[PDB]
Amino acid sequence: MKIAEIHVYAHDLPVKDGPYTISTVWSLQTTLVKIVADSGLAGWGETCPVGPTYAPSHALGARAALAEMAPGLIGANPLQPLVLRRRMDGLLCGHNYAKAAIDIAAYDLMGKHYGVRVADLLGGVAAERVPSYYATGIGQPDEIARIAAEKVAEGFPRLQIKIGGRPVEIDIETVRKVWERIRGTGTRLAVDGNRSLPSRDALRLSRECPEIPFVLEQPCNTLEEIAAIRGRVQHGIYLDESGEDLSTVIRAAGQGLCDGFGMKLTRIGGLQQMAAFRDICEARALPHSCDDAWGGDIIAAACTHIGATVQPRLNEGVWVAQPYIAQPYDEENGIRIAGGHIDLPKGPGLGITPDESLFGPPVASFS
Amino acid sequence: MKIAEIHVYAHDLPVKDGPYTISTVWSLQTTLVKIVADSGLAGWGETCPVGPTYAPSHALGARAALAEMAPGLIGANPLQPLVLRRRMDGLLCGHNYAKAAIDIAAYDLMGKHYGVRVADLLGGVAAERVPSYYATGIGQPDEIARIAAEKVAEGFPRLQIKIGGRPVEIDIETVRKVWERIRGTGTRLAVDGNRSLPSRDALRLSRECPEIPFVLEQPCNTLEEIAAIRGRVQHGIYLDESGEDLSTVIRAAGQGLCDGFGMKLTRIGGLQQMAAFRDICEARALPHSCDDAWGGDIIAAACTHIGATVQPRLNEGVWVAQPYIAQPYDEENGIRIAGGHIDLPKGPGLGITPDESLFGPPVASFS
Amino acid sequence: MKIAEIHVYAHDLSLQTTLVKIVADSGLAGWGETCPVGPTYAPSHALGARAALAEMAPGLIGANPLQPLVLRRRMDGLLCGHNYAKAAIDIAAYDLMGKHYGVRVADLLGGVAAERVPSYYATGIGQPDEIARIAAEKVAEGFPRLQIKIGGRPVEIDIETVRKVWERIRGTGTRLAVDGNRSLPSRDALRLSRECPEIPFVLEQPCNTLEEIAAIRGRVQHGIYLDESGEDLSTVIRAAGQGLCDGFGMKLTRIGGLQQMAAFRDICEARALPHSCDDAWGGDIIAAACTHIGATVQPRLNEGVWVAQPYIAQPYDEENGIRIAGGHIDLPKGPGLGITPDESLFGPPVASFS
Amino acid sequence: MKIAEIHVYAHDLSLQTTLVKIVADSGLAGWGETCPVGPTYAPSHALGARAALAEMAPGLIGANPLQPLVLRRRMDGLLCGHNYAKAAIDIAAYDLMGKHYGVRVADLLGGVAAERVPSYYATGIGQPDEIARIAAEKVAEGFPRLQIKIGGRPVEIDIETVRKVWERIRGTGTRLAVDGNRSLPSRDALRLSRECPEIPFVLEQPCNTLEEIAAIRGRVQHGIYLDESGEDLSTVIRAAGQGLCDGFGMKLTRIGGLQQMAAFRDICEARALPHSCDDAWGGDIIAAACTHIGATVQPRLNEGVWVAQPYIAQPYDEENGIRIAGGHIDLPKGPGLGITPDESLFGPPVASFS
Ligand SMILES: [Mg+2]
Ligand SMILES: [Mg+2]
Ligand SMILES: [Mg+2]
Ligand SMILES: [Mg+2]
Ligand SMILES: [Mg+2]
Ligand SMILES: [Mg+2]
């Protein structure tokens, strides 16, 4: 097989009952990639930054990066994801979030070609139904507590409470009121500082609440700050935004700098790298989620496929933007949350067939 | 431009309702510097140690250091603060507190020359009104608690409780009674040991009060002692007196030895170095104050100008001695606390025009 | 698809190799192999291999052989450790997968990065002049890398050997490794490197434990590679994350199979740590497995694939077995491992499970 | 004063450079530039530059261009990362500031410490004898420092190049840097330093990651400089505070502009860490910006300002553009950057915002 065509698409996704406050976002522009083989067989990828301020990545940026690489990828074998990743690195440094769109499209194409689900190309389906988790927005303490209780009732096995960007007393009150509503339900709790807490405040949050079993997710902006407070914090600490590449994961795992990860597939550079990430975590019993920043059926299915291969006791869940998205790409097999969990699609490849019409004509085509 | 004249002045400032107990001080002698350019344009600086025992600096010392350097500064370009600092280092080693008086006078002169506020020469005004904080003296627990409540009512967003020099049980009682009066007002709390606590007592203070959200400011005498207890202390620790120069700040930030700073402008050597200090803290999300030991309108305006450039979420405030000083240098635009905050002066340079007569004739003049 | 039968074979090469044949419901078969290089090199041996396989086999009947990670966890649920035995099952399943999808194993592990894989030649211990001659002969045959085995005798002799080998190969563009095979006290590893700064070897597993290696690393100016100490992925992660070594000699059977070997490769690539893809010993089946993972390694980080072929008289597959040619190995063309063993050579299974 | 217009230009040099023109309400204009040295040197590229600028520009209209730190925070509020693009806006604002106050940019960054700024010459990869000749020719032209690029081939050749260059320049008082451009495995970086103690190079960014550099630093007796690893001020603070390097090659666009470059300079000066003030590539505008910050560096710590000028046929400003003369660069005399680009050379903007 050989890549004959690459098509790049721009597409809008508005948030139902927005805004979503982390980066505050009111609507999203996702970028889709279609790879077409010699045989006419096609595979789909997707990348969608959650606003331009959450990570060093944006929509205009994804398309420029993809247009930079695409002519150099015509003629490449799409059935060789590691060889393909190296070829990409030879065309553009960094830009993992754009390279991930190509990597996903290639696995989709591989699965369709061999007649196999992407999860089975990544080591095999460990669970047909994968846990998810609900991430609350920043808001009033009592209202976040009400939402938390409602989501536990829906069947979510884990909740992530977003905090920061305001006095930490309010964050602390939110955490306590949420715990009061969900204690004794067996629901797991994460508190996500989204890089916004000075060490002063991360120390206070943990010191004041030893009896509340949260993990502190990316509380500070840099890995250096996190490494400095770790010894003084008795709650587990997870890395998210700091987990920028496999090399950094190796540093954090090998030097014992964290107790887990919230990992985004686009950030690490795609499924080839994500599988290696998964294996490092499993060797060290580090729980992790398999998420992305945002996006529709394509990126959501990719996250679900890698999530289905994770050892169940280490699976902190797969987050998807589906509940905030009005129009799915695939009304028949698209990714849906049901009872706080996600059923893996049953068909070959990602198991998703995008209604290509929805996206409009490509903003760029390459052959 | 060139420096034509440098004039050094000695001037007394008595503390209203003194003494102020940290070093116990009953009145203060400040030192002022006037730099006069070829064009006759003038700029003002000030340095005022808070008694001779708080830091390795004193009033007689400032004037001897200034007289040592001044003949070597005639003819220098006052519009080049880094070049000027290097020229000073070539005349006298150390003595940052005296070099700072010259540095401030040079920025004042620059601002007047270009028609720009000093804060806009330091990166720009981030806030026209800067927060301040109130520092209580050492005293009886109930009385310090009463004062704390009164200052919160005045609008101070942060309080610093001075402790030490007596059994730590009394310091601990003070902290608890203050917290009882201000809890739930959103007021931030610092406890300043002013180098006086053995590690034994700093450990006890933090261990006994996990539920009281203070930061522990310079609890022990040396940075070495602080580095040794850090891992065992669950409250944030700020450096003050230990932050002697930019090199030490780089050590503390880069090795993760503290969670913030109380920084004095004269100690670091002036505004050129203070701006670099600010940038290091901002890169690491380390909150800090912009203070000095003491002094009137000149040094207070200099602290306020650098304070106005600090990222608001990292600004622990600007401390000034104004409420303890009877006669301001500038009755029209001089620095005043109002509602626990300080309005930045609106005019060019420091925005301060000292009533030169107040100071008396210079004790030393150079041309 | 499901595993319907597992057959275990014993075969002499001598060294006692152990072959595994996995048969699916369809009758489609995959082959694996494991062959400890004597019972004293590693915590592994031939009788142990067959015992471990006998322990796991009944609990693997009915398993899906197309899911290498799920299969590895299932094995872990039947027997702790024993990676050298688990590796035989893992290899057979990849062979079967490849045949099922009609794809080379290397293209199931990320893709072929090179059809011609470099090898390296490992000299046994011997007299300095004789080792130096063999070094020169092997360079002439095309091997791009030589590994000189030392230890078990006064280090003066090891140092003499290294200097004479270097005399012969300097300027040929040949890379040099000196393998202490866990046998040097720190005392001697320090002396070896201290006396020879102008000789560009890497020091491979000079000392017995990772602890001893971490203790001398700062005092040694030659790159240090881990071999025997790289017992599992967790230890690789420690060594890479804490900067305890500059490369690896990695054995497929030691790490537990191709699934784990692929993750090990990705860790090394992220940190620019060169490595070889070897095993202790064995014929076409284990040799093919090493060649396949070797073909996926970034060429600039590939220290080579070692195989026992030159020491083995009878290949399992006369047409397409692994052969060294010009110091390199060509990747087989066929699906799976690309190897088809003549089962008549092995005799009937010593154990069958169904 | 407020930003009223931002105009983005594309121009070939080939390398694709991107120019930015900021126009204030008064009509007063400032110029910036960013030009990645190919899309593979750094996580940056020309199409990416224009995309990032297009993302930020609308949100910058109305901003006060006389407040470089407030402006930087405002940019951060519009787009995370992308320092190489932010740098173009930062430079244009300093140019505008300088013109507004009638002051050279260097005197807005602390003051001119030298009117004549040292440069250094960077040899591309090539054959050892040819590189050695170019080294000698460039020393004769007056360059006080030479940087030799290596890697991407067997290290024996890099070592031969270094030795031949040294043969030619020893005794001329020329300083030497050897740049590995992220391409050496620890194995080879160790060998390079181990074999050449008598050659006084610093080893610049030998390995890909800061992690690998921290791991070999104690075993390497030559000074080590960071380049590509110095991605932001936070990483500089780590490297300086933990003693992970002995100096820096710093690129203005990588660190995000002159505001951050000034703080970086102050950190290096406090720790006596020598550094260069460079960028990837580009014409008079980026070259002038580097020269201005370079003119503020303590002379004893100034490793030089590199510019692409010798490789560029058409300067933007025929009268006062940046030129290398005698291995040094004279600081322009005029206000702002002291440069006045002939806009007719660039063609109309590819994007305009108002
Ligand atoms: Mg997160
Ligand atoms: Mg203090
Ligand atoms: Mg050869
Ligand atoms: Mg070995
Ligand atoms: Mg010279
Ligand atoms: Mg460089």
PDB file of C-alpha atoms in Angstrom, chain B residues 8-130:
ATOM      1  CA  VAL B   8      24.044  63.126  49.347  1.00  0.00           C
ATOM      2  CA  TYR B   9      21.639  64.127  52.138  1.00  0.00           C
ATOM      3  CA  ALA B  10      21.015  62.867  55.668  1.00  0.00           C
ATOM      4  CA  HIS B  11      17.467  63.167  57.018  1.00  0.00           C
ATOM      5  CA  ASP B  12      15.535  62.015  60.119  1.00  0.00           C
ATOM      6  CA  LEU B  13      12.154  60.188  60.232  1.00  0.00           C
ATOM      7  CA  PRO B  14      10.587  59.443  63.662  1.00  0.00           C
ATOM      8  CA  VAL B  15       8.035  56.600  63.999  1.00  0.00           C
ATOM      9  CA  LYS B  16       4.537  57.732  65.003  1.00  0.00           C
ATOM     10  CA  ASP B  17       3.459  55.699  68.048  1.00  0.00           C
ATOM     11  CA  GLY B  18       6.760  53.834  68.172  1.00  0.00           C
ATOM     12  CA  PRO B  19       8.653  51.772  68.878  1.00  0.00           C
ATOM     13  CA  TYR B  20       8.201  49.326  66.001  1.00  0.00           C
ATOM     14  CA  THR B  21       9.372  45.875  67.153  1.00  0.00           C
ATOM     15  CA  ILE B  22      10.884  43.392  64.685  1.00  0.00           C
ATOM     16  CA  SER B  23      15.559  45.136  65.429  1.00  0.00           C
ATOM     17  CA  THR B  24      13.600  47.584  67.619  1.00  0.00           C
ATOM     18  CA  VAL B  25      13.459  51.080  66.108  1.00  0.00           C
ATOM     19  CA  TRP B  26      12.355  54.438  67.623  1.00  0.00           C
ATOM     20  CA  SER B  27      13.422  56.822  64.835  1.00  0.00           C
ATOM     21  CA  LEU B  28      15.092  56.485  61.444  1.00  0.00           C
ATOM     22  CA  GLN B  29      17.794  58.259  59.490  1.00  0.00           C
ATOM     23  CA  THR B  30      17.276  57.977  55.762  1.00  0.00           C
ATOM     24  CA  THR B  31      19.803  58.886  53.080  1.00  0.00           C
ATOM     25  CA  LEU B  32      18.793  60.712  49.885  1.00  0.00           C
ATOM     26  CA  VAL B  33      20.713  61.088  46.632  1.00  0.00           C
ATOM     27  CA  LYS B  34      20.200  63.778  44.001  1.00  0.00           C
ATOM     28  CA  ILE B  35      21.748  63.196  40.567  1.00  0.00           C
ATOM     29  CA  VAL B  36      21.962  66.299  38.368  1.00  0.00           C
ATOM     30  CA  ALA B  37      22.528  66.005  34.605  1.00  0.00           C
ATOM     31  CA  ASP B  38      24.406  68.382  32.272  1.00  0.00           C
ATOM     32  CA  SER B  39      21.043  69.818  31.255  1.00  0.00           C
ATOM     33  CA  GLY B  40      20.213  70.580  34.879  1.00  0.00           C
ATOM     34  CA  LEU B  41      17.585  67.830  34.935  1.00  0.00           C
ATOM     35  CA  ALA B  42      17.496  66.000  38.287  1.00  0.00           C
ATOM     36  CA  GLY B  43      16.597  62.557  39.651  1.00  0.00           C
ATOM     37  CA  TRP B  44      16.149  61.338  43.234  1.00  0.00           C
ATOM     38  CA  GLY B  45      16.980  58.134  45.109  1.00  0.00           C
ATOM     39  CA  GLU B  46      16.696  56.991  48.715  1.00  0.00           C
ATOM     40  CA  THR B  47      18.006  54.274  51.019  1.00  0.00           C
ATOM     41  CA  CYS B  48      17.027  53.711  54.664  1.00  0.00           C
ATOM     42  CA  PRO B  49      18.069  50.655  56.721  1.00  0.00           C
ATOM     43  CA  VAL B  50      15.518  49.662  59.402  1.00  0.00           C
ATOM     44  CA  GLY B  51      17.932  50.016  62.295  1.00  0.00           C
ATOM     45  CA  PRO B  52      21.530  48.737  62.074  1.00  0.00           C
ATOM     46  CA  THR B  53      20.724  45.145  63.182  1.00  0.00           C
ATOM     47  CA  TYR B  54      18.066  43.917  60.687  1.00  0.00           C
ATOM     48  CA  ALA B  55      20.441  43.584  57.694  1.00  0.00           C
ATOM     49  CA  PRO B  56      24.181  44.179  57.048  1.00  0.00           C
ATOM     50  CA  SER B  57      23.505  47.860  56.283  1.00  0.00           C
ATOM     51  CA  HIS B  58      23.273  51.191  58.173  1.00  0.00           C
ATOM     52  CA  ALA B  59      22.861  54.969  57.653  1.00  0.00           C
ATOM     53  CA  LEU B  60      26.479  56.010  58.233  1.00  0.00           C
ATOM     54  CA  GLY B  61      27.377  53.066  55.994  1.00  0.00           C
ATOM     55  CA  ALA B  62      25.155  54.193  53.128  1.00  0.00           C
ATOM     56  CA  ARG B  63      26.747  57.657  53.063  1.00  0.00           C
ATOM     57  CA  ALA B  64      30.310  56.329  53.229  1.00  0.00           C
ATOM     58  CA  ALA B  65      29.539  53.924  50.359  1.00  0.00           C
ATOM     59  CA  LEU B  66      27.958  56.717  48.307  1.00  0.00           C
ATOM     60  CA  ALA B  67      30.910  59.047  48.932  1.00  0.00           C
ATOM     61  CA  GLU B  68      33.243  56.233  47.878  1.00  0.00           C
ATOM     62  CA  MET B  69      31.494  55.805  44.487  1.00  0.00           C
ATOM     63  CA  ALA B  70      30.340  59.303  43.548  1.00  0.00           C
ATOM     64  CA  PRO B  71      33.563  60.794  42.147  1.00  0.00           C
ATOM     65  CA  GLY B  72      33.857  57.772  39.823  1.00  0.00           C
ATOM     66  CA  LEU B  73      30.312  58.351  38.545  1.00  0.00           C
ATOM     67  CA  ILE B  74      30.717  61.955  37.376  1.00  0.00           C
ATOM     68  CA  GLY B  75      30.452  61.952  33.583  1.00  0.00           C
ATOM     69  CA  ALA B  76      28.511  58.672  33.349  1.00  0.00           C
ATOM     70  CA  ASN B  77      25.378  58.353  31.206  1.00  0.00           C
ATOM     71  CA  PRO B  78      22.413  58.166  33.600  1.00  0.00           C
ATOM     72  CA  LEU B  79      20.106  56.784  30.878  1.00  0.00           C
ATOM     73  CA  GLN B  80      21.825  53.370  30.934  1.00  0.00           C
ATOM     74  CA  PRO B  81      20.987  51.571  34.194  1.00  0.00           C
ATOM     75  CA  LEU B  82      22.868  48.311  33.466  1.00  0.00           C
ATOM     76  CA  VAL B  83      26.006  50.080  32.222  1.00  0.00           C
ATOM     77  CA  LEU B  84      25.750  52.316  35.293  1.00  0.00           C
ATOM     78  CA  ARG B  85      25.444  49.309  37.662  1.00  0.00           C
ATOM     79  CA  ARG B  86      28.573  47.753  36.183  1.00  0.00           C
ATOM     80  CA  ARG B  87      30.427  51.038  36.595  1.00  0.00           C
ATOM     81  CA  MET B  88      29.419  51.064  40.267  1.00  0.00           C
ATOM     82  CA  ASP B  89      30.592  47.459  40.792  1.00  0.00           C
ATOM     83  CA  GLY B  90      33.951  48.607  39.444  1.00  0.00           C
ATOM     84  CA  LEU B  91      34.168  51.195  42.225  1.00  0.00           C
ATOM     85  CA  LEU B  92      32.851  49.256  45.238  1.00  0.00           C
ATOM     86  CA  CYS B  93      32.093  45.614  45.951  1.00  0.00           C
ATOM     87  CA  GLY B  94      28.707  44.752  47.484  1.00  0.00           C
ATOM     88  CA  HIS B  95      26.810  47.528  49.285  1.00  0.00           C
ATOM     89  CA  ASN B  96      23.682  46.920  47.213  1.00  0.00           C
ATOM     90  CA  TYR B  97      21.669  49.145  49.552  1.00  0.00           C
ATOM     91  CA  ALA B  98      23.774  52.166  48.577  1.00  0.00           C
ATOM     92  CA  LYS B  99      23.998  51.293  44.881  1.00  0.00           C
ATOM     93  CA  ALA B 100      20.175  51.127  44.886  1.00  0.00           C
ATOM     94  CA  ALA B 101      19.910  54.832  45.785  1.00  0.00           C
ATOM     95  CA  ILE B 102      21.895  55.711  42.642  1.00  0.00           C
ATOM     96  CA  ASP B 103      19.953  53.233  40.462  1.00  0.00           C
ATOM     97  CA  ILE B 104      16.634  54.722  41.600  1.00  0.00           C
ATOM     98  CA  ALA B 105      17.806  58.293  40.966  1.00  0.00           C
ATOM     99  CA  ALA B 106      18.847  57.256  37.460  1.00  0.00           C
ATOM    100  CA  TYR B 107      15.455  55.731  36.581  1.00  0.00           C
ATOM    101  CA  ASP B 108      13.723  58.857  37.960  1.00  0.00           C
ATOM    102  CA  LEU B 109      15.934  60.964  35.677  1.00  0.00           C
ATOM    103  CA  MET B 110      15.260  58.649  32.683  1.00  0.00           C
ATOM    104  CA  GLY B 111      11.503  58.833  33.133  1.00  0.00           C
ATOM    105  CA  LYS B 112      11.550  62.619  33.326  1.00  0.00           C
ATOM    106  CA  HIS B 113      13.793  62.826  30.279  1.00  0.00           C
ATOM    107  CA  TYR B 114      11.683  60.573  28.029  1.00  0.00           C
ATOM    108  CA  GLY B 115       8.403  61.684  29.617  1.00  0.00           C
ATOM    109  CA  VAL B 116       7.426  58.246  30.895  1.00  0.00           C
ATOM    110  CA  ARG B 117       6.558  56.631  34.241  1.00  0.00           C
ATOM    111  CA  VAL B 118       9.246  54.437  35.757  1.00  0.00           C
ATOM    112  CA  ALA B 119       6.853  51.454  35.718  1.00  0.00           C
ATOM    113  CA  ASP B 120       6.599  51.787  31.922  1.00  0.00           C
ATOM    114  CA  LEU B 121      10.409  51.663  31.679  1.00  0.00           C
ATOM    115  CA  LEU B 122      10.275  48.371  33.583  1.00  0.00           C
ATOM    116  CA  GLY B 123       7.916  46.567  31.254  1.00  0.00           C
ATOM    117  CA  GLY B 124       4.684  48.455  31.767  1.00  0.00           C
ATOM    118  CA  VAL B 125       1.872  49.224  34.195  1.00  0.00           C
ATOM    119  CA  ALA B 126      -0.100  46.039  34.885  1.00  0.00           C
ATOM    120  CA  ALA B 127      -2.220  47.733  37.565  1.00  0.00           C
ATOM    121  CA  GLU B 128      -2.746  51.416  38.441  1.00  0.00           C
ATOM    122  CA  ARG B 129      -3.655  50.501  42.015  1.00  0.00           C
ATOM    123  CA  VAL B 130      -1.344  48.098  43.842  1.00  0.00           C
TER     124      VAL B 130
END
